[PDB]
Amino acid sequence: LRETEERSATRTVMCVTDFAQRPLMFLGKDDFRALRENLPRIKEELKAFK
Amino acid sequence: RGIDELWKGSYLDPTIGAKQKEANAVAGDAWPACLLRMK
Amino acid sequence: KQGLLASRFYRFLVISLMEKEGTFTYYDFYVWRKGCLAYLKAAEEEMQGIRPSTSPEFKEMELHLKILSHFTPEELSRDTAEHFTSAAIKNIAKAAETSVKNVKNVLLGHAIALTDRTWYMRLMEMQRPIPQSVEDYLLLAETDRPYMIRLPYGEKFYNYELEEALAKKRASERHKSQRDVPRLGRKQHRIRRLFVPNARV
Amino acid sequence: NKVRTDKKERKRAFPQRGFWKKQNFLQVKNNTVRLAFAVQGVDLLKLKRLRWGEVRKGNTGWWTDDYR
Amino acid sequence: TEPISHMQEKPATLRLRGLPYRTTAEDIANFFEGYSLAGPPDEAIQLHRRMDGRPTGWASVYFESEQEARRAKQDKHRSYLHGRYIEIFINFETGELEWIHQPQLSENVNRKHHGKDNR
Amino acid sequence: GWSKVVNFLNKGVQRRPHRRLPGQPHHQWNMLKTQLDQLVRSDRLELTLPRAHELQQYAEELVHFAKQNTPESSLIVESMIFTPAARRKLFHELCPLYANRPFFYTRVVNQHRLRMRDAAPMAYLEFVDRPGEIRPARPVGFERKQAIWEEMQATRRGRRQWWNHAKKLGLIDEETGDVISDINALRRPSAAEWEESDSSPSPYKMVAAPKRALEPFFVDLPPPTERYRKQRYVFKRFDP
Amino acid sequence: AVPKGKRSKHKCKQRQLIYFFDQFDGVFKRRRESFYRSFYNPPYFSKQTEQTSLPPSVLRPFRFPGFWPGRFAFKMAS
Amino acid sequence: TKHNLTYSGRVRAFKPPSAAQRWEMGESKYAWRLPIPNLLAGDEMQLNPALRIDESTTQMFPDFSKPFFHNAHFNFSWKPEEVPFQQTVKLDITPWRR
Amino acid sequence: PNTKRRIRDPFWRRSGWWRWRQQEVKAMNRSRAFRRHLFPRFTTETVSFVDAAEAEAKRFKEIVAETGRYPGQTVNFFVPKVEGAKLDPFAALPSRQKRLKLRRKAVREAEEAEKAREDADFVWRGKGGGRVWEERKANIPLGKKKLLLYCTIIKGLQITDAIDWLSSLCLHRVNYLLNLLNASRKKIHEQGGDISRVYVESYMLNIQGQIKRPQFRLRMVNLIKTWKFAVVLRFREYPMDEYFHKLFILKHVPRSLTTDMRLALAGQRVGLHAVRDWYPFLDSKTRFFHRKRLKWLDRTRQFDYCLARRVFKSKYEENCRRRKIQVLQARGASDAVIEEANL
RNA sequence: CCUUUUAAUUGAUUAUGCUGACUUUAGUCCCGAUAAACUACAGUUCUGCUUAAACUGAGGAGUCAAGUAGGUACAAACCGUACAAGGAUUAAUU
Incomplete structure (x- = not known):
């Protein structure tokens, strides 16, 4: 009675959660690397908007 | 080791089925005094 | 030969009942x-x-x-x-x-299927053995099988099986005399206790 | 008391608008019971909420029906 | 009598709720694409309006058979149309008069010792 | 009691502009703010008819001042609202949704039924133009222009009945004296859209869906309305 | 202050009728009118009675078959 | 449910300290570093208590030079020497006199 | 509420409700009510309802009183009931419920017999007649004063009208009356009565007692009471002729029926012909103007009471028969089964 | 039946009579102190008051009462509940 379906855990992804582990956003490796590349300009934009 | 005898084979036994419980529950007559006097 | 078929038929019955x-x-x-x-x-x-x-x-x-x-x-x-x-x-x-x-x-039969599905769901969730024969089912249902849900404000829960069972139980129990039943706070008839036969011996 | 020897029935002869529900205390107790069951893999709340004849394995429901 | 509103006997019907203001009979027909209606969309689909013609958000769709109506309900219940999932209901009786079997009404309503609800 | 005493005691009496809730004024204000926050979070609340009628005005005030987008109106909205979830929902969903709506962002619907437990008349108070609304919201702005244009073209009665309003709306062509042909010519960018001054094969490309983009993978979690739940009421036992 | 005599059966009957009319015209007529106007909308479905109630429905029955000119049921399919 | 519930009107469960928590015949909190226990452990057991830390309960280590709670990671009734000198404040009960 | 609503008083009025005024006004009202009737101008017979069980009981008791003996007794004499007696001197006679059952049997037999009588379409029968049920519910925790209100509400109404009435009130203790009404309606339907023409003809309240509880106060101890009452309702299935004369001629139509008609028309669940079909019963204005039209046609002798009654009865019966046939057909029944169901 | 007798303590509209039932007052008086939500795509309503640690070598600083007053299905039921070595060395089994 307790047997259930079989799924495939094969999609690597990063999860960002709040203090209570509630999910907020999921990013793949490509998005992560794009953010990493664009980081330096983001700091300048933060400074300018401050 | 021996304490199991308080429930083994009875309706409290968890390792046996209903038919076995009924079969174990069947019982005969009580010892009559006439036969008891011969022991 | 027939025993294996009957046991597997019961297993299939239970599993296919709980599939949906x-x-x-x-x-x-x-x-x-x-x-x-x-x-x-x-x-x-x-x-x-x-x-x-x-x-x-x-x-x-x-x-x-x-x-x-x-x-x-x-x-x-x-x-x-x-x-x-x-x-x-x-x-x-x-x-x-x-x-x-x-x-x-x-x-x-449908109502019994509903009750059995609820009972099996509870047993499975609590990880208790499911009865594996008609005899085990009957032995356990006399003490463990659910029959109703209690609701607020006095509304009635509908069970076709319970309706039928209660009707039959009332029919059987009605007019069963309490003449010789010892009831707390009721005076007893000692002479009738002395000569009327008692079936519990 | 259970033997009904006290005089607590005297106040119940007068109307009152309402009564406290002690929901904070009762919910703490209920969640303690739920945690005790859940650490062993039992969804007591789901069982209590199931409809008559309804079977739901795992943490499933109307949303599972919708997306499957 | 060709018009459905004129027929003394109506085909199997379904009632749709959740329709945005933009919804049109053609949109409903496209939503029901693949299911046999009782006629051309202008007759099979009838949006419900008030005295001023404002949409009510409710529609009546006629099908050629009860089997097709129930199949359409099963397939399209809670499916999306213009960003809002639509709810579908049968909208015809069985003739058995089930309303005669009313539930037993509580005779022990202890209001002051039960939890709050909007029953 | 006697029903005619209501007439007797209300002969020559004015209706109170504000319905007074139980408790002291600070408690009443706190209750109204809390229920406004909950209404923002839920898009609709089942209330008693008087309470819906009372909370409607504060909902309207919240939307009206949130739209203005000035420090003063922001502080007003802050004084009206309690929770970050309500703040986020308001500013990021309701304000863009009502960007072209001048006023009247809510509605009260009388259920025409008395509550079982206490015979309290019941109603709904809901924000307008949201998915699942009780009845469909009427259009505003260019969408309203298009609706009137379609009505004018549908029949001659519509043309006559909207003729004067159409002149102000700009749907009448002065050269020919008839209704314009290309209503799309009246399209203009709206505040709800993303200004384009900023001007597919990825394995994790998001999939289009009616309300939010969907991830191309599955996570075993119920929807947020079902993730965390508790018994609505734990029974309190009678002590005899 | 207390009554100086017992109110008679005649006057008690009069009071019964007067209070009946008062309650009628003050509560019962209004409640019945609201109840009959509510029929133009689908019946209320309490989410706290899901566990035992029927699935939500919109149809309201026509309860006098002798005045129904249309069809009562559809023929069985095949 | 086991002992996670009390099956009476008792609200707060009272349990005396366990035998391992006692001192005599109790578990020494530094015995895992001794030779004989490690000789007996073999490959069946790992005695380092750092391996039994529940990731979902413990907090990150703080800087000892900055304000922080003692209960987070110490779990004993004494002050580690690595925590800097602490200020002892004595109440001023008669400010008016001075 | 409206705060200006006119609340009625049965004994006083601003316009003048002295006893002479009441006499004059009620004479006017009686005249209007009588003139509201349209009567057939030709009938073959004036059959009147009689109750054989009641007549036989009356004659039995008259004989007992006149001769001091049971009918057929020649030696012994009648023995009245005394204290402690366990024998009912009138045990041979049927009980009230038995008489009701015999009335239903006689009504069924006469209904069957009328289907094979020539000139049955030109016979006047009158108000009384039809089957009668008496249903009782006990252990109601309400008093006489409230039960009188709740029963005065529903007396004389059609059963579904009464159920709607009592359901609209949102009173917890009216659930007892609602349960009684629902059970009675279900029972009559199962026995084969036409729910559409069952009315609440009368009620009866029977006290059972009152449970008393102490209430301790400053200087005395009081006793607060919870009532125990039973309610007996009399339901009557109107014969088709009476149903026609009530709904069609006098325009006394159940509001539940009218609401169902209006809901059907609003939802477009029926054809456009339904408007003229239901015009005689739909709304107050339509009913008034149809009554005027019928009065004019009768006074010009173009209206035919018997033909109108026959048309109404045939339409009603054919609608019911169609319901039965189509619900049978929805099951996939065979032609033989359907044909045999009509015998 | 009639007749004769009966010591029956034999006739009740009334003792602020006694034991009770049932009306009128009357559907009248009586309703204790602060409350909401449980969601068509994340969350943290507001208020009153503040001993809420439950091993860290230490029975966790008392007495008394409940003739078992916080167990248990929206139960004024049935069933169950005070272990002085605290028994799960259960880092086990799987």
């Missing part, structure tokens, strides 16, 4: 009963390869399926017997060429 998820409607009942009948027919095929078809139980399953086939689609989508009118049951019996008694037997 969500509400259990008359259509799901019909599908499950058809699966059971097909399993019996395949078992008969295996037996003859090396009689279920001629058994009264087999004929009764056929009659149940025939009665179900005369349910309207909305009745099949329903999941309780609350709104089946006596006229509707009579018309179903007329259309199926059967008896009101057999139609009510189909309804009672």
